[model samples]
Target: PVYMVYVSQDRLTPSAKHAVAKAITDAHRGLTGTQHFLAQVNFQEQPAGNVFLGGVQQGGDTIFVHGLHREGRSADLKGQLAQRIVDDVSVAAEIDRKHIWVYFGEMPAQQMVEYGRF
Candidate 1:
C-alpha cells in the first residue's frame, strides 16, 4: 500500500485559507485508490512585537492533508501525486513554491505480521 502526505503552513490570510482548501479537494478528486484522506487547518495568534520590535503581529495557519491508498506501489505514481499536491496548493494560495512539502510512505507485506501466527 502507498500513502501520500501533504503539509503546508502560511500566514493568516484569505488566500492561504482558500489555497489550502482547494489543494485538499483537488488532490482528493485527482488521486486513485485513496482509501482515506484527512485535512486539517491550524490557527495561532501571536503577540505584537514579540519576536522583533519592528515586525507586525499576525496570526498564521497551517494546513495538512494525508491520503492513504491500498494498492501496488509505484515510484512514478507516488512522485506524480506529490507534485500535483504542491502545484495545486502553490497556485491556489499564491504562496512560495518552497513552502509546500509532500511526502510518501509505503507499507509492504513484509512489514506486517499476523497477531497470532508469528
Candidate 2:
C-alpha cells in the first residue's frame, strides 16, 4: 500500500510536511496492523495558488491526501483512517479541519505496477 499526499508548499513548513506524512502512514499501519502492508508514503508540494477549491480558485492553503492501496478493508476502517488523517493534516498545516480532504483509491494488486514488476 502507498499514499501520495498533496499540499501547497506555501501552506506548511518543511517540518509540518514531515509531520503529516508520518502521521498518515502511521494511521494506515494501525489499520492494517503491520508494516508489510505498507510500502511507501510521500508528500508532494505544489506551488501556491496552483490549486482550486470547487469552481473557484480560492487561496491554496488547503491539503489533499490521496491514498492508493489494494481493496479489502471495511468501510469502518476507512472512515477511521480518514478521520485520523484529517486531524493530523489539519494540525500540521495549521489549517481548518474542514479544509482538508482525505480519499482512498482502492484497486487490485494486479492492476498496479511497481518497478516493472509489482
Candidate 3:
C-alpha cells in the first residue's frame, strides 16, 4: 500500500468516486513511478451543514482531498505534487479548482508501513 486518499464533498456520485480513485492512483504513479502505489480510498458525502469553509457553511462545489506521502522530499517537489494532484482531481471531477481543497500529509519514510513493514 503506497497511497491513501480521502475525499469529502457535499455532492458526489459513484462515477465520480471511480474517477477519483483512478486519478489518485495515476497521480501517485506519475510522481513515484510505481504502479503499485495505491492503497485505501475513502470518499464521503456529507450534508450541507456538515462542511464548513472559512468559518462559514459550505455545500455546493465543495471538495476536499487529503493524501499522504512518504516524507523527506524537497519542498519544491511536494508543492508540485500537490498542485498536480488538485489539477488531476479537478479535471476528473469537472469541478472548479478554486473551490477544491487539496492537502498532502507526510510520514517518515521509515514509518510508512506496507505489509507490516516499512
Measured against the true structure, the TM-scores of the candidates, in listed sequence, are 0.48, 0.83, 0.80
- Cα lDDT of candidate 2 equals 0.77
lDDT of 1 by residue, 3-80 (tens): 232232324366666566656556645674433333333333344333322365422322233444333757787678
lDDT of 3 by residue, 1-118 (tens): 3444334553567897788778877776777665544455666665556667779976567777777777777888777777887898898889888877777788877877766766
Per TM-score, the best of the predicted structures is: 2
lDDT of 1 at 58: 29
State in Å the error of residue 5, model 1.
Answer: 8.5
Error of 2 at 41 (Å): 2.4
Q: Candidate 1: deviation at residue 51, Å?
A: 13
Models ranked on TM-score: 2, 3, 1
Q: lDDT scores for all predictions? A: 0.49, 0.77, 0.70
> For model 1, what is the error of residue 28's alpha carbon versus the real structure, in angstroms, after optimal superposition?
3.3
Q: For candidate 3, what is the total of clashing residue pairs?
A: 0
Candidate order by lDDT, decreasing, is 2, 3, 1
Residue 50 accuracy (lDDT) in model 2: 78
